[PDB]
Design a binder for this molecule. Sequence first.
Ligand SMILES: Nc1ncnc2c1ncn2[C@@H]1O[C@H](COP(=O)(O)OP(=O)(O)OP(=O)(O)O)[C@@H](O)[C@H]1O
Ligand SMILES: Nc1ncnc2c1ncn2[C@@H]1O[C@H](COP(=O)(O)OP(=O)(O)O)[C@@H](O)[C@H]1O
Lengths: 209, 525
Amino acid sequence: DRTPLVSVLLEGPPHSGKTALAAKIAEESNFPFIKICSPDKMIGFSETAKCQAMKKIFDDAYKSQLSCVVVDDIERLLDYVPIGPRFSNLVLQALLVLLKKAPPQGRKLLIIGTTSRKDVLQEMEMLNAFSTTIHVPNIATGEQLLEALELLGNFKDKERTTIAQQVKGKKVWIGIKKLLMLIEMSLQMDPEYRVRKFLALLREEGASP
Amino acid sequence: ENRQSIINPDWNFEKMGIGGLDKEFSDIFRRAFASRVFPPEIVEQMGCKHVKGILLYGPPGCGKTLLARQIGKMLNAREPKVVNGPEILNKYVGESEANIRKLFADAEEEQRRLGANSGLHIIIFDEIDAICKQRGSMAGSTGVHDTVVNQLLSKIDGVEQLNNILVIGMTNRPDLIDEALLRPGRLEVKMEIGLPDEKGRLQILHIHTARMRGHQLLSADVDIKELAVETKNFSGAELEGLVRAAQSTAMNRHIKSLQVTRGDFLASLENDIKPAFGTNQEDYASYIMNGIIKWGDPVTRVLDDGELLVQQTKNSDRTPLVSVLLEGPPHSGKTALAAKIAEESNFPFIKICSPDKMIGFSETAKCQAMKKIFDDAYKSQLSCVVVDDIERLLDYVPIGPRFSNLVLQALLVLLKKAPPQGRKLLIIGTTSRKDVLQEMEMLNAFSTTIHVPNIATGEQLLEALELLGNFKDKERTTIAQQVKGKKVWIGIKKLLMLIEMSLQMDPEYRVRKFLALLREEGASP
Ligand SMILES: Nc1ncnc2c1ncn2[C@@H]1O[C@H](COP(=O)(O)OP(=O)(O)OP(=O)(O)O)[C@@H](O)[C@H]1O
Ligand SMILES: Nc1ncnc2c1ncn2[C@@H]1O[C@H](COP(=O)(O)OP(=O)(O)O)[C@@H](O)[C@H]1O
């Protein structure tokens, strides 16, 4: 009763699987009003149109005893580009004002945000408007890689042994989505060179933090 | 008197003249008009109103109006009132509403004169999404067409009830229409009319060749299975046009047994009909000119990689969207290799997007054009879209730097949007400045990169000269001895220019000029 409005930020390295987890968290809450505000439905719009669209969704969220609105890929909403820098200010101000406006008496809300560049957000005075943050990590240890491979269930046993032998004595820095992509890319060779090319691709992609 | 005779005395479905839709009609019949044929006693006892309109959306040319007229002619209704969207608007105050208010007059009159025993009236709209758009709310920012929508909403479902009307809307942009115009009270049933598959084309050809078959004017070699398999993404209009062109070409041939034959259909298909959701040879003929000769291994490597990527995007389901980037030094012939990789794919739908057709456009128009190409690409089951120059779209220029930001965001959002369920796509890019693209953090959107190298040895140059075939053996020996040192670094679009600039010199002051030009060009990595 002393906190009708909450917020949270999910951030981490790219290709790490952030939007899926936000969608799952929203799905498994049993609230009666769940909505997603993504930036691929606003291709070609101007600043004012984006403001009006976000405002309309939030306005609709104020007529229900419970709600959950997801706002993903903030940096695309702002139109950030490292050169300059250059972005949109009006959308930023609207977003910074909508994050601490309470609903009418007796109603509740919950906002989840997603991003991949936390420092730039910190510069613009935006980590002060959120209530907490969570961290989504990349795959770190080779045993996790083997577990993910087995759960996906793609490579056979002896191939698993070779991969484990050559990938269990070092470090690994790979995202899950990129892992799916690499597996599918490697599966197109003849049945003899599959493991060799998978190892080559993993070695090439393997980059220091 | 029981009004169970709304159904016309005799009706078959397939005889109507429509072929290719069999679940759309089934669902429409079940959900909409199952209460216009049941005996009036039960309908009256249960006390239920009737559906008051429907919406139809899909591509342009797939037979929407035909279905509306057939629906109307089913229910013994009166003559439909066909209207057009942009033909209602007017410049004076109080004219558009007057036009919109003159369609519901006869229904109201006949409701007055005979209450509850009147006949169905039908109204057919067209491009409905040109008059009705979402209404604004901010004070002082209300739109300019906020009275037409009000005057239509207040009439479809108002304070005085009309129970003898049915409204059908047709549009191609289902996402621009208002939200208060689609609640279960008005225009509640929505249907999609999509491109036909093999069975659809087979039935559409049977229907349109029934007349010729009956009149004994078809030869005994023309078979419809192969003509159905040949046409890939044809709509209905382009099938009827094909049949008509075939008959006309046969008649013209007769002028010099007037029975059409395989050859007539094949010629008409090849040279008369061009689909709008299919491949076109004009682009390949215009971009790949002077052919693709081989002068080394790199060409083979590039083509092999392209083939592998095509196979992956075809035969996988975990990743229904792929991308790739071809980058190399300027003048190295990148667009031709891209258009070649696309032409060997054997995909139903191929299209090229280049800035040659957007001279003088403001950035918003460029966004619209790119978006329209992708929107069309999302309607097929396989596709391949090429983006020609990823630096002339942004308007990059080293001073500043200066460029456009709207187009860049549109492009960065369109490289990660997957197509509707169960469809596939492939994107090929091309650029000469990898580093600048890397600075804007767009070089990690593309899945993979490929390199297009340059001439780097004497024997490669000699083999290119041999393939082009312009000099004699003694001249070849002279050039080989003069440029034996392997310090050659030239493009493959510039070598043709150097050759052609020298050939028009003089009988034997040619090779001297060619060598001088080759030396002056320089060689750096
Ligand atoms: N093996 C080859 N590879 C590429 N192009 C070739 C080859 N053989 C012949 N050509 C011809 O070379 C020309 C290459 O011109 P193209 O416009 O592709 O160059 P580009 O580098 O893309 O252009 P720009 O220099 O403006 O960036 C075409 O006319 C093509 O037919
Ligand atoms: N399912 C179909 N079966 C047979 N012919 C069709 C079909 N769909 C369209 N056509 C042809 O298309 C023409 C009408 O197209 P039209 O209804 O004007 O398309 P749209 O409604 O998209 O404007 C007719 O001449 C008809 O022969």
